[PDB]
Amino acid sequence: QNLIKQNCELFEQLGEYKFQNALLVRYTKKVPQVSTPTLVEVSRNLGKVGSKCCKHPEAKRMPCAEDYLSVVLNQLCVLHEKTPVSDRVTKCCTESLVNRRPCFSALEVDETYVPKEFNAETFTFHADICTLSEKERQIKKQTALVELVKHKPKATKEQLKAVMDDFAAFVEKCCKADDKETCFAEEGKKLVAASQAALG
Ligand SMILES: Cc1ccc(SCCNc2ccc(S(=O)(=O)NC(=O)c3ccc(-c4ccc(F)cc4)cc3)cc2[N+](=O)[O-])c(C)c1
């Protein structure tokens, strides 16, 4: 049961957004090839959910979470049905009742990533990213790193932290100039030009 507390204490130690950074890499790797928005659908909720439970003792801690915990799963039942993706997760999408959770929890990492996306032309930044709806930044500023995982899982957290400081600056100028529109493209491409070559 402690497994639940470990996250409860960690959630407060880090936060709501950061906490997702970890769960994300875990959820993403857990079910590869399940679309980005999807993983965020539940992830974004699970993370923010931490706020729903943070005041009552261990006694009312779990119970307070069970509320959404039971709701989410119930939603995935029909939700997943609409999205016929995956296998091990799909085949075990509709059981004979009484063995829905067990079949899920019992299931471990699969990493059965057969397909891939080599579309470099796609994916853009655009200026709207820092003009049309600021709140959007919440989701926008997150998938960028996720893409790197899908393209090549297994990253260096120690090194990632470093870039986190440099990224804070990039975004700053990214939207704080007269001709930011061109910068987003020019500057946005430059970064890709250096990465395309190599990283180390
Ligand atoms: C249609 C579809 C398919 C996949 C996905 S991505 C997420 C895959 N689903 C998933 C993954 C792991 C676990 S798990 O490993 O058994 N549970 C956890 O990892 C877990 C982590 C943290 C907490 C936690 C609880 C309380 C708290 F305060 C903090 C953390 C609880 C459970 C459970 C599910 N699930 O039920 O769908 C999508 C999106 C759609």
From Swiss-Prot:
Glycans are attached at K29, K55, K60, D110, K141, K150, K152, K161, K189. It is found in: Secreted. The record marks 5, 18, 30, 48, 52, 82, 91, 116, 135, 140, 154, 157, 173, 176, 180, 190 as: Not glycated. Changing E117K: In Manaus-1/Adana/Lambadi/Vancouver. Changing E186K: In Osaka-2/Phnom Phen/albumin B/Verona. It is linked to Hyperthyroxinemia, familial dysalbuminemic: A disorder characterized by abnormally elevated levels of total serum thyroxine (T4) in euthyroid patients. It is due to abnormal serum albumin that binds T4 with enhanced affinity. Binds water, Ca(2+), Na(+), K(+), fatty acids, hormones, bilirubin and drugs. Its main function is the regulation of the colloidal osmotic pressure of blood. Major zinc transporter in plasma, typically binds about 80% of all plasma zinc. Major calcium and magnesium transporter in plasma, binds approximately 45% of circulating calcium and magnesium in plasma. Potentially has more than two calcium-binding sites and might additionally bind calcium in a non-specific manner. This is Albumin. The gene is ALB. The chain holds residues 409 to 608 of 609 of the full protein.
